[PDB]
Amino acid sequence: ISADQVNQIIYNLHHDPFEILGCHLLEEGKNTKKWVVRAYLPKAEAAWVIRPTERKEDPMNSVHHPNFFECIIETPELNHYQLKVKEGEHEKVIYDPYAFSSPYLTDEDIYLFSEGNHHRIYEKLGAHVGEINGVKGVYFAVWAPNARNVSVIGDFNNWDGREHQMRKRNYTIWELFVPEIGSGTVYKYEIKNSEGHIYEKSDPYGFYREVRPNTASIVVDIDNIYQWHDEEWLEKRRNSDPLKQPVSVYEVHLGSWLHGSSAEKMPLLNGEADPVIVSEWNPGARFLSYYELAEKLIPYVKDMGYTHIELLPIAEHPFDGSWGYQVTGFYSPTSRFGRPEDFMYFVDKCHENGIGVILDWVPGHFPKDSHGLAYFDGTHLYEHADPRIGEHKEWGTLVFNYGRHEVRNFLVANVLFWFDKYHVDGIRVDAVASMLYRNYLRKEGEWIANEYGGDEHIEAVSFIREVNTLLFEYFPGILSIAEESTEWEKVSRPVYDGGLGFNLKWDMGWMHDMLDYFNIDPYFRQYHQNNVTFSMLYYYNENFMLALSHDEIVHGKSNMLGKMPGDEWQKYANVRALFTYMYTHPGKKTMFMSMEFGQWSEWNVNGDLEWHLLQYEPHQQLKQFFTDLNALYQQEPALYTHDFEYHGFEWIDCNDNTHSVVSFLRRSDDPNDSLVVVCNFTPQPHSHYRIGVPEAGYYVELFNSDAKQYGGSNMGNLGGKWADEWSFHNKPYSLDLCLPPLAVLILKLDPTKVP
Ligand SMILES: OC[C@H]1O[C@H](O[C@H]2[C@H](O)[C@@H](O)[C@@H](O[C@H]3[C@H](O)[C@@H](O)[C@@H](O[C@H]4[C@H](O)[C@@H](O)[C@@H](O[C@H]5[C@H](O)[C@@H](O)[C@@H](O[C@H]6[C@H](O)[C@@H](O)[C@@H](O[C@H]7[C@H](O)[C@@H](O)[C@@H](O)O[C@@H]7CO)O[C@@H]6CO)O[C@@H]5CO)O[C@@H]4CO)O[C@@H]3CO)O[C@@H]2CO)[C@H](O)[C@@H](O)[C@@H]1O
Ligand SMILES: OC[C@H]1O[C@H](O[C@H]2[C@H](O)[C@@H](O)[C@@H](O[C@H]3[C@H](O)[C@@H](O)[C@@H](O[C@H]4[C@H](O)[C@@H](O)[C@@H](O)O[C@@H]4CO)O[C@@H]3CO)O[C@@H]2CO)[C@H](O)[C@@H](O)[C@@H]1O
Ligand SMILES: OC[C@H]1O[C@H](O[C@H]2[C@H](O)[C@@H](O)[C@@H](O[C@H]3[C@H](O)[C@@H](O)[C@@H](O[C@H]4[C@H](O)[C@@H](O)[C@@H](O)O[C@@H]4CO)O[C@@H]3CO)O[C@@H]2CO)[C@H](O)[C@@H](O)[C@@H]1O
Ligand SMILES: OC[C@H]1O[C@H](O[C@H]2[C@H](O)[C@@H](O)[C@@H](O[C@H]3[C@H](O)[C@@H](O)[C@@H](O[C@H]4[C@H](O)[C@@H](O)[C@@H](O)O[C@@H]4CO)O[C@@H]3CO)O[C@@H]2CO)[C@H](O)[C@@H](O)[C@@H]1O
Ligand SMILES: OC[C@H]1O[C@H](O[C@H]2[C@H](O)[C@@H](O)[C@@H](O[C@H]3[C@H](O)[C@@H](O)[C@@H](O)O[C@@H]3CO)O[C@@H]2CO)[C@H](O)[C@@H](O)[C@@H]1O
Ligand SMILES: OC[C@H]1O[C@H](O[C@H]2[C@H](O)[C@@H](O)[C@@H](O[C@H]3[C@H](O)[C@@H](O)[C@@H](O)O[C@@H]3CO)O[C@@H]2CO)[C@H](O)[C@@H](O)[C@@H]1O
Ligand SMILES: [Mg+2]
């Protein structure tokens, strides 16, 4: 380009910067094409064009001005890129602000979508504020290839669509531009199918929705409602390996953590809305907004010391009792708790306080509700038409057709959507088996095999691989967590090694061993020592997340205290011993709200947590316990650097089943960070109990779950102990310990202590 064209951009004289900025074709070769990307990045010294799906990166060069950049790239198609922008010591990675010159669908958009490869389809499908023919308005577009007609109905035409009939393009997508309406417009699509029957649909790609049970979509100007402050958090995430960090997750259902009074409005970020009553049976209570949750949940979690919050599904969902797992509005955060900008604020505030956000994401099915995706255009559009692969009959839901390109694209782009517009740090996918198996909860004769005669749902496996491949490429450093309950291999290994591509998997076997173990009367635990140690046999086949989740404190399973045998003191002691063991055992950590303060009753999604219990000392002490355990977790590298390497763990001894005692080492990069952990899983203390240790010195008591400030009886080693030169458990040195009752000790050699 010429210096005069550059100067016209720099001094804001240019008539249309899209002519020059963004991506433009320079020429066609035989097998490839040559493109230029340009950007004006005031305050950037350097920049790069990332092609994350091709694994390439190209530097940009300054041209005529130090902040005007150009990059020439040869490739057949330049559809998927990002800009990396360096301003002083900081980098950010963004989509090109000049990627799309128009609000309407181009031929390229339609072609990529038809192939299932439009990573940003939600920039053009749904409803967006823009300008067409010189007039400001909203562009609507919806995929519905077998509809006979579609119209936009809404507040602006009194729900009569006759003069807002949409125009069909390439036999596949309906569009319409409506002048002079803007954000806040309430609308649906009125679809006529092949039979002539008329229905009303929420926008599949809608960005906001009325409060359940109403279902009209609402137009949002999603790039102009919130200003973020988390560049530094995002840069740090992109540059780190989250597998080598502490990850302690507080799992939360937003609708039932804490309620407010329905006698007042719900405050929002600079505004307010009517209260959303939690149910007709409990009309005095309302949900808290995302804004109120940012003000109360976030400091509560920060002060507990968790590194992440994991949310049960916040995509829009019509029925409270699904807990979120039956979604019909995939592209909108639930209006139960306010507006999209309120949830953006929530995320931004987590990031400011050093907390990541993991979303439960539900690509596995969707319910039949008629406002939603079902039978969308009068055909089996989103769901497979054959109920043997297209319905989960036991659940009453429909299963997406993962092999259909536009359906795959709906979901692939959806996962990217949450990382792009809402800045989240990970996803967790529930019930992955339900997607992977063609015979899932289906009896003989009621499913069919894949094309090779197997049970593998080939299209689902392929979809899942694509999700994880693209997620990590576009947003490196995130968490992608699977719960998969049948022994499928390599769930949390790279797609290039034959894996499904997650980086963490819930260790469901471990959860069952532990909760079955601690439920057994302590005298009988000697017959079940294997529960304590079995999971370390297959542990290195995946990267495990140790999760004690919501699903384990409902439906008559009891909350944590209630699972435990004995009197009140022993119930608390068992909870502390179990969780000290969970936090010292290899793997990342997840626990669910209410577990951290000893709620007696099961989680009940129609009320909120029993916060009044925190008036009383026992509950306060257990909460302090978790507060201190989380701090210890972040402070001791051997609890997190080598979770997934042999070096990070070794049993010292586990043959004392008779006393239900086990002991082990944790290690990190530095040998002086090594820990010794000793567990006593009966209420019988032991007085001069020897444990081998690998070196001489003074082993400081870092943590003792029987300390009185945790509710314990206060037995212990008085702060530490000198090792003896007394071979034991095949080790040259040994500690002669007091083992407190129903308790775990964590010890660390201080090699600078003087004898
Ligand atoms: O994560 C929470 C928290 O955990 C740790 O802190 C805990 C401790 O783990 C826990 O034991 C306790 O320690 C407090 C203690 O309560 C305070 O009284 C004080 O301890 C004093 C002690 O009072 C002084 O006497 C002095 O101790 C001498 C001791 O008098 C002397 O006899 C000898 O002891 C040896 C003893 O003779 C042996 O028989 C044996 O003793 C065993 C018994 O065999 C056993 O049957 C059972 O009853 O317990 C005895 C204790 O092991 O071995 C003894 C060697 O240990 O030598 C000692 C050497 O001093 O000194 C200390 C002053 O240090 O302070 C301690 C330390 O705080 O409560 C705390 C908190 O609840 C962790 O330290 C902390 O960081 C964490 O926050
Ligand atoms: O109006 C003229 C034509 O209309 C009719 O064809 C329709 C079908 O009824 C629609 O359902 C649709 O079909 C698309 C489909 O939507 C799309 O996903 C893609 O299908 C792929 C699939 O994703 C992939 O997994 C694999 O199985 O291959 C499939 C076939 O390519 O493409 C379909 C075909 O276009 O759209 C058309 C057009 O509206 C009518 O049946 C035609 O005979 C008629 O000419
Ligand atoms: O000198 C004090 C004693 O030190 C050691 O006693 C231990 C027990 O061995 C441990 O099991 C534990 O005791 C728990 C006990 O397991 C539990 O059931 C509960 O018992 C209380 C009960 O809550 C209370 O309401 C009332 O019934 O009295 C019971 C007191 O026994 O709580 C106990 C702890 O408070 O810890 C103690 C103290 O460390 C040692 O083994 C004893 O020989 C010694 O006497
Ligand atoms: O009470 C007086 C005695 O107390 C002390 O003995 C303790 C040990 O210090 C503890 O380590 C433990 O002993 C365990 C041992 O740790 C464990 O490995 C297992 O020992 C098996 C062994 O693994 C196996 O190879 C084989 O050789 O048999 C061993 C004996 O069965 O189980 C042991 C406990 O049964 O607990 C004892 C107390 O029971 C002190 O050291 C004693 O000298 C003292 O008399
Ligand atoms: O104050 C007027 C009115 O506002 C609210 O009703 C709105 C609905 O919540 C909203 O869904 C929409 O209803 C349309 C349906 O979505 C559509 O499928 C079809 O059946 O037409 C409806 C419009 O007639 O609009 C209504 C009206 O704004 C509030 O909930 C009402 O009770 C209230 O009276
Ligand atoms: O080096 C082999 C192995 O050593 C350690 O594994 C021990 C287990 O952790 C422990 O549970 C036990 O395994 C037995 C099971 O408990 C039982 O249910 C059944 O399947 O038999 C198992 C056969 O041993 O003992 C093993 C072997 O010591 C360590 O934890 C591993 O990481 C390590 O690879
Ligand atoms: Mg309540």
Short mmCIF file of N, CA, C and O and ligand atoms in Angstrom, two decimals, residues 653 655-656 659 688-690 728-729, ligand 4:
data_model
loop_
_atom_site.label_atom_id
_atom_site.label_comp_id
_atom_site.label_asym_id
_atom_site.label_seq_id
_atom_site.Cartn_x
_atom_site.Cartn_y
_atom_site.Cartn_z
N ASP A 653 4.07 -46.63 52.37
CA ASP A 653 3.52 -47.96 52.69
C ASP A 653 1.99 -47.94 52.68
O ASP A 653 1.36 -47.04 53.27
N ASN A 655 0.44 -51.39 53.37
CA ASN A 655 0.07 -52.76 53.83
C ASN A 655 -0.57 -52.80 55.18
O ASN A 655 -1.01 -53.85 55.58
N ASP A 656 -0.62 -51.69 55.93
CA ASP A 656 -1.29 -51.75 57.22
C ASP A 656 -2.80 -51.58 57.03
O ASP A 656 -3.41 -50.52 57.43
N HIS A 659 -4.92 -51.35 60.53
CA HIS A 659 -5.19 -50.06 61.17
C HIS A 659 -5.70 -48.98 60.17
O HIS A 659 -5.83 -47.83 60.53
N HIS A 688 3.38 -44.42 68.56
CA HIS A 688 4.81 -44.36 68.16
C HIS A 688 4.83 -45.16 66.92
O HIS A 688 5.33 -46.30 66.97
N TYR A 689 4.26 -44.57 65.85
CA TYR A 689 3.97 -45.26 64.58
C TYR A 689 5.02 -44.84 63.61
O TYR A 689 5.14 -43.67 63.28
N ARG A 690 5.76 -45.78 63.08
CA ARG A 690 6.91 -45.46 62.31
C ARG A 690 6.56 -45.44 60.83
O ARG A 690 5.90 -46.32 60.36
N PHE A 728 13.25 -48.27 57.57
CA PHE A 728 11.82 -48.66 57.64
C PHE A 728 11.11 -48.48 56.29
O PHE A 728 11.43 -47.55 55.53
N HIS A 729 10.17 -49.36 55.96
CA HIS A 729 9.53 -49.26 54.64
C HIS A 729 10.53 -49.07 53.49
O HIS A 729 10.27 -48.35 52.48
O1 LIG B 4 2.77 -50.87 69.67
C1 LIG B 4 4.09 -51.24 69.91
C2 LIG B 4 4.72 -51.17 68.53
O2 LIG B 4 4.44 -49.92 67.80
C3 LIG B 4 5.26 -49.67 66.65
O3 LIG B 4 4.87 -50.50 65.52
C4 LIG B 4 4.07 -49.92 64.52
C5 LIG B 4 4.86 -49.49 63.29
O4 LIG B 4 5.73 -48.49 63.72
C6 LIG B 4 3.95 -48.98 62.15
O5 LIG B 4 4.64 -48.80 60.94
C7 LIG B 4 2.90 -50.05 61.87
O6 LIG B 4 3.48 -51.24 61.37
C8 LIG B 4 2.87 -51.71 60.21
C9 LIG B 4 3.81 -51.62 59.04
O7 LIG B 4 4.00 -50.23 58.84
C10 LIG B 4 3.18 -52.26 57.82
O8 LIG B 4 4.11 -52.22 56.78
C11 LIG B 4 2.66 -53.67 58.16
O9 LIG B 4 3.82 -54.51 58.46
C12 LIG B 4 3.88 -55.79 57.83
C13 LIG B 4 4.78 -55.68 56.59
O10 LIG B 4 4.36 -54.65 55.70
C14 LIG B 4 5.00 -57.07 55.94
O11 LIG B 4 6.06 -57.03 55.01
C15 LIG B 4 5.36 -58.20 56.94
O12 LIG B 4 6.74 -58.27 57.24
O13 LIG B 4 4.64 -58.05 58.15
C16 LIG B 4 4.67 -56.78 58.75
C17 LIG B 4 4.07 -57.00 60.12
O14 LIG B 4 2.82 -57.49 59.72
O15 LIG B 4 1.73 -53.64 59.27
C18 LIG B 4 2.41 -53.14 60.41
C19 LIG B 4 1.46 -53.04 61.58
O16 LIG B 4 0.90 -54.29 61.61
O17 LIG B 4 2.23 -50.33 63.06
C20 LIG B 4 3.00 -50.92 64.14
C21 LIG B 4 2.08 -51.12 65.38
O18 LIG B 4 1.17 -52.14 65.05
C22 LIG B 4 6.77 -49.97 66.90
O19 LIG B 4 7.52 -49.86 65.70
C23 LIG B 4 6.90 -51.43 67.40
O20 LIG B 4 8.21 -51.97 67.40
C24 LIG B 4 6.20 -51.53 68.76
O21 LIG B 4 6.28 -52.83 69.33
#
